[model samples]
Target chain A: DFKKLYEQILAENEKLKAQLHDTNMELTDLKLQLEKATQRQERF
Target chain B: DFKKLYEQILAENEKLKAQLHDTNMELTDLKLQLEKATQRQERF
Candidate 1:
C-alpha cells in the first residue's frame, strides 16, 4: 500500500533526525573537550 | 504528486546520512586530538 510506504518513510525520517541529533550532540561534546585540552596545553 | 514527495524524502534521508558521517568523522578526529593532548600533558 502507498500509505504503508508513506508511514515507513515517516518513521525512517524521524529516526534519522534523532540519530543526527545524537551525533551532533556527541560531536559538540568532543569539541568542547578538545578545546579544554588545548587550553590546558597552553599552560605548558 | 506522491512520487515527488517520495523523492523529497529520499533526498532528505541521504542528506542526513551524509551529515551523520561527517559529524562522526569530526567527533573521531577531536577525540584523537584530545588523546594526543592528554599524552602531551603527561610529559610535563
Candidate 2:
C-alpha cells in the first residue's frame, strides 16, 4: 500500500513536470512570434 | 497516515498551480512588451 502511494505521487510529479515544459514551450513560441511581428513593422 | 499523504499531495498541487500562474503572467508581460516594441518600430 505504501509503495502504491509512492508511485502515485511520482506519477503526479511527472505529470506536473510535463505541463511545465509545455507551458515553457508555448512561451518560447509566443516570444518568437512577437519578434517576427516587430521585425515586420520595422521594415515598413 | 493516508490523510497526511493526501495533504502532502494537495500541497504539491497548489505549488504547481502557483508556478503555472507565475509562468502565465510572465508570458503575458512578454507579449505586452512585444506589442509595444512593434508599435514603436512602426512609428519609425
Candidate 3:
C-alpha cells in the first residue's frame, strides 16, 4: 500500500543512528573532561 | 566515588545501543517488505 512511507521511516531511522553515535562519542569525552577537571582541583 | 557514576552512565549507554540494534533489525525488515510490495504493484 503506502510503500513510500516505509522508505521514509527507514531513512529517518538511519539518521537517528548517526545522531546517537555522535551522542555516545560526546558522552565519552564529557566523562574524560570531568575526570581531568576533578584531578586538577585536587592538585590545587 | 565519581568514577562509579561514569560507569553507570556507560552501562546505560550500552543498554541503549542494544535497543537501537533491535530497532535497526526491525527497520530493515520493513524496508524489505516495502521493496517487495513496490515490485508487486509495478508488475500488476
Each prediction's whole-model lDDT (CA)? 0.72, 0.70, 0.49
Ranked candidates, highest DockQ first: 1, 2, 3
After superposition, the stretches of candidate 2 with alpha carbons farther than 4 Å from their true spots are A1-16, A31-44, B39-44
Residue B31 shift from truth in candidate 1, angstroms = 1.2
Model 1, backbone clash pairs (residues 3+ apart or across chains), number: 0
Off by over 4 Å in 1: A40-44, B38-44
Native-interface RMSD of candidate 3: 23.3
lDDT of 1 at A8: 81
How good is the docking of model 1, by CAPRI class?
Answer: acceptable
> By TM-score, who's the top model here?
1
The clash number for model 2 is 0
Give a tens-digit lDDT track for model 1, residues A1-44.
Answer: 57776788778988999998998898678756766766643542
Q: How far is A8's C-alpha from truth in model 3 (Å)?
A: 31
Q: Model 3: residues >4 Å from true position, as ranges?
A: A1-44, B40-44
Q: How far out, in Å, is residue A44 in model 2?
A: 28
lDDT of 2 at A37: 66
- Evaluate model 1: give its lDDT: 0.72
| TM-scores, chain B, all models | 0.71, 0.75, 0.76
Model 3: per-residue lDDT, tens digit, B1-44? 55554455556556666866765565445434544444322322
